């Protein structure tokens, strides 16, 4: 069905429908697919779904000139811990990714691989089964009681990374980025948001370290910036973006309750601008808005009203992708895209609307999403959401 109470607005007369260049890619509009974990990868080996993933991405690439950021992809076994999320370290994985990237490019769209390391969000029992550590910044603060207990039961207590282990992750980020480009991706996004490992280093709640990787703003940002620099060197700044969620609380990050949180993120933005002014500007910065501090709460819930991401624009002077509850709020998008370097990521409603871009241009009703099939091993709720035309044929204008 269509979302019942929604009053759509046509956005074709806004900058959402003006072309923009991101990295090497000439986008034809500014509606971006943000990274969306869907849990259709198959075990063993974290293999992108051999039956359905090409179709899923093909459907969502259908509007020419769309920027797609993939579902999060693990850079190595140690970086993972969810059996049904994909990786980008193995030949068997890259065979499937190549097909996905080719399909997106055949639709004249673009694809950026999000590179993920889970840290404390991983399942410690899966890691133990596979002979892997349960990693985070620290060893004395935990995501929640259940995770702490699972780790202990698995004889895999949370481990504070050594400097050498940080370096090993950096090597894996580099190789994952190389694999992504060699397989045909247009670029990569470094996931430093949503309470995953790099965010666990950025945040003073999760990072109680007293070495050079914690205990100050500069130290907490060190790992993220080392990954940025290593990837810029390996594949070029034009093929690298960075995702941040300053106000996020998902995965036990601090959000606005931490009075130093804006400074922490302002520092990162400043360091990116410094690199840019020195000739190595990242393709984009991608921000999760305080509109959505936890993406598993219904739109409108978990909104933080005490802060804005606008500060980033005073510091970083490149493209900015903003995501969080924008599909149901075209009136907000209309204002935000007046800024000529702003793009809008649409997550949950891209799950349910493969032709979302047409719907945004033309002010059409939106398909309701089905949260129960966000994570499921099924084509249902993955590749069977209809286009607007298909929905009309199903009678959804009258349901």
Ligand X SMILES: C=C(C)c1ccc(C)c(O)c1
Ligand Y SMILES: Cc1cc2nc3c(=O)[nH]c(=O)nc-3n(C[C@H](O)[C@H](O)[C@H](O)COP(=O)(O)O)c2cc1C
User: What is the contact surface with ligand X in residues (CB under 6 A)?
Assistant: 37, 72, 82, 85, 116, 194, 295
Min. distance of Cβ 297 from ligand X in angstroms?
Answer: 11
Min. distance of Cβ 277 from a copy of itself in angstroms?
Answer: 7
Contact status, residue 209 vs residue 165, Cβ threshold 8 Å: no
Quote the CA–CA distance of 119 and 197 in Å, as a whole number.
4
Distance from the Cα of residue 322 to its chain's centroid? 11
Interface residue with a copy of itself, options 44, 131, 306, 395 (CB under 8 A): 306
Minimum CB distance to ligand Y smaller for 82 or for 128: 82
The closest alpha carbon to 304, from 293, 294, 319, 318, belongs to 293
Quote the CA–CA distance of 355 and 257 in Å, as a whole number.
38
Residue 162 DSSP label:
P
For a copy of itself, how many residues bind (rule: CB under 8 A)? 25
Which residue out of 173, 196, 304, 388 is catalytically annotated? Answer: 196
Report whether 58 belongs to an annotated binding site: no
Minimum CB distance to ligand Y smaller for 230 or for 292: 292
Minimum CB distance to a copy of itself smaller for 261 or for 344: 261
Quote the CA–CA distance of 209 and 301 in Å, as a whole number.
33
Contact status, residue 34 vs residue 347, Cβ threshold 8 Å: yes
According to the binding rule CB under 8 A, does residue 204 interact with a copy of itself?
A: no
To the query of whether residue 196 is one of the catalytic residues in this protein, the response is: yes
Helix (H, G, I), strand (E, B) or coil at 114: strand
Contact mark string toward Cl ion, 73..102, x via CB under 5 A? ---------xx-------------------
According to the binding rule CB under 6 A, does residue 56 interact with ligand Y?
A: no
Interface residue with Na ion, options 308, 376, 378, 387 (CB under 5 A): 308
Written as one string, the DSSP assignment of 37-87 is: ----PBTTTTBPPTTTHHHHHHHHT-STT-EEE-S-EESSTTT---TTS-B
Contact mark string toward Mg ion, 45..84, x via CB under 5 A? ----------------------------------------
Interface residue with a copy of itself, options 18, 129, 274, 362 (CB under 8 A): 274
According to the binding rule CB under 8 A, does residue 318 interact with a copy of itself?
A: no
Min. distance of Cβ 118 from Cl ion in angstroms?
Answer: 11
According to the binding rule CB under 5 A, does residue 168 interact with Na ion?
A: no
Minimum CB distance to Mg ion smaller for 188 or for 383: 383
In sequence order, which ranges of 44-85 are alpha helices (DSSP H)?
A: 53-60
Neighbouring C-beta atoms of residue 338, cutoff 10 Å: 10
Minimum CB distance to a copy of itself smaller for 126 or for 264: 264
Directed axis angle between helix 261-277 and helix 217-235, to 10°?
Answer: 30
Quote the CA–CA distance of 285 and 309 in Å, as a whole number.
12
According to the binding rule CB under 5 A, does residue 384 interact with Cl ion?
A: no
The interface with Mg ion within residues 343-372 (CB under 5 A) comprises: 372
The closest alpha carbon to 282, from 239, 311, 245, 313, belongs to 239
Minimum CB distance to ligand Y smaller for 198 or for 288: 288
Tokens of 136: 């985070």
Contact mark string toward ligand Y, 5..34, x via CB under 6 A? -----------------------------x
Tokens of 5: 């109470």
Quote the CA–CA distance of 32 and 36 in Å, as a whole number.
12
Contact status, residue 16 vs residue 344, Cβ threshold 8 Å: yes
Q: Is the dihedral of CA 9, 11, 12, 14 positive or negative?
A: positive
CA end-to-end span of the chain: 7
Quote the CA–CA distance of 62 and 371 in Å, as a whole number.
23
Minimum CB distance to ligand Y smaller for 114 or for 207: 114
Quote the CA–CA distance of 238 and 220 in Å, as a whole number.
25
Contact mark string toward ligand Y, 65..104, x via CB under 6 A? ------xx--------------------------------
Q: Which residues sit in the known binding site for substrate?
A: 191, 194, 375
Q: Which residues sit in the known binding site?
A: 37, 114, 191, 194, 243, 348, 375
Give the footprint of ligand Y on this chain (CB under 6 A).
34-37, 71-72, 114, 191, 193-194, 243, 288, 292, 295, 323-327, 346-348, 374
Give the footprint of a copy of itself on this chain (CB under 8 A).
216-218, 256, 259-263, 266-267, 269-271, 273-274, 277, 306-308, 310-311, 314-315, 317
Active site amino acids = 196
């Amino acid at each position: 069905s269509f979302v019942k109470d929604f009053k759509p607005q046509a956005l074709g007369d806004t900058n959402l429908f003006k072309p923009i260049k991101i990295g090497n890619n000439e986008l034809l509009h500014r509606a971006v697919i943000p990274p969306l974990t869907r849990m259709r990868a198959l075990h063993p080996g974290n293999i992108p779904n051999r039956d359905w993933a090409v179709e899923y991405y093909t459907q969502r690439a259908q509007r020419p000139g769309t920027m797609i950021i993939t579902e999060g992809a693990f850079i190595s076994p140690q970086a993972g811990g969810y059996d049904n999320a994909p990786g980008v370290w193995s030949e068997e994985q890259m065979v499937e990714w190549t097909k996905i990237f080719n399909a997106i490019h055949e639709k004249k769209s673009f694809v950026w691989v999000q590179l993920v390391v889970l840290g404390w969000a991983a399942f410690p029992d899966n890691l133990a089964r596979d002979g892997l550590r349960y990693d985070s910044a620290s060893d004395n603060v935990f995501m929640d009681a259940e995770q702490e207990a699972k780790a202990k039961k698995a004889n895999n207590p949370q481990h504070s990374l050594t400097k050498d282990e940080i370096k090993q992750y950096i090597k894996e980020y580099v190789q994952a980025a190389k694999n992504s480009i060699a397989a045909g991706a247009d670029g990569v996004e470094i996931h430093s948001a949503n309470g995953y490992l790099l965010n666990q280093f950025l945040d003073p709640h999760s990072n109680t370290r007293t070495d050079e990787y914690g205990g100050s703003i500069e130290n907490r940002a060190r790992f993220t910036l080392e990954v940025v620099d290593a990837l810029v060197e390996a594949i070029g700044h034009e093929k690298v973006g960075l995702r941040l969620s300053p106000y996020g609380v998902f995965n036990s990050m601090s959000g606005g309750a931490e009075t130093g949180i804006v400074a922490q993120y302002a520092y990162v933005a400043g360091e990116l601008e410094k690199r840019a002014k020195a000739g190595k500007r990242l393709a984009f910065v991608h921000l999760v808005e305080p509109r959505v501090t936890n993406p598993f709460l219904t739109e409108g819930e978990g909104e933080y009203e005490g802060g804005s991401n606008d500060f980033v624009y005073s510091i970083w002077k490149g493209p900015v992708i903003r995501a969080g509850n924008f599909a149901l709020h075209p009136e907000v998008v209309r204002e935000e895209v007046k800024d000529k370097r702003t793009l809008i990521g649409y997550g949950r409603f891209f799950i349910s609307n493969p032709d979302l871009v047409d719907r945004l241009e033309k002010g059409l009703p939106l398909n309701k999403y089905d949260r129960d099939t966000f994570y499921q091993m099924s084509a249902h709720g993955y590749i069977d959401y209809p286009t607007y035309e298909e929905a009309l044929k199903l009678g959804w204008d009258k349901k």
